[PDB]
């Protein structure tokens, strides 16, 4: 039972930059395209009916030469990092996986970029863990 969030879905919060859809590969209707500017984010909520840990994987795509480390704070701070490399093309998405604890209620999830390149395009966050479905933003 994992969920998927995706732009323009319910729990995606904000992006500080665009959703866009011009490179091939995504899913859903596009992805996260942050500012070139650090600590720009992209933020989700997810309702978990239990605290627990969870697995969260980030699928995103880096056509730069250089890593374009996230931080991933939950609840405005636990504090995590996220490395997010090169994928060598706009076009080819990897993903980061990270695991998490998620309190019980809501878990506002925001991942900033950690340099003045923002972070990498980012596709979509899916959570596995226990029961968890769309939070509230805010
Ligand atoms: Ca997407
Ligand atoms: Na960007």
Not at 35 to 58: F, K, P, Y
Not at 75 to 104: E, F, H, K
Not at 111 to 118: I, M, R
């Amino acid at each position: 039972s994992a969920l998927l969030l995706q732009e323009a879905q319910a729990g995606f919060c904000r992006v500080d930059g665009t959703i866009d859809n011009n490179h091939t590969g995504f899913t859903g209707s596009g992805f996260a395209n942050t500012n070139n500017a650090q600590g720009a984010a992209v933020v989700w909520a997810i309702d978990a009916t239990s605290s627990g840990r969870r697995t969260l994987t980030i699928r995103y795509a880096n056509g730069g030469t250089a890593n374009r480390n996230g931080s991933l704070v939950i609840n405005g701070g636990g504090n995590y990092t996220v490395s997010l490399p090169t994928t060598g093309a706009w076009t080819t998405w990897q993903t980061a996986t990270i695991d998490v604890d998620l309190v019980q209620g809501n878990n506002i999830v925001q991942l900033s970029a950690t340099t003045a390149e923002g972070l990498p395009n980012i596709d979509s966050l899916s959570v596995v863990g226990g029961t968890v479905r769309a939070g509230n933003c805010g």
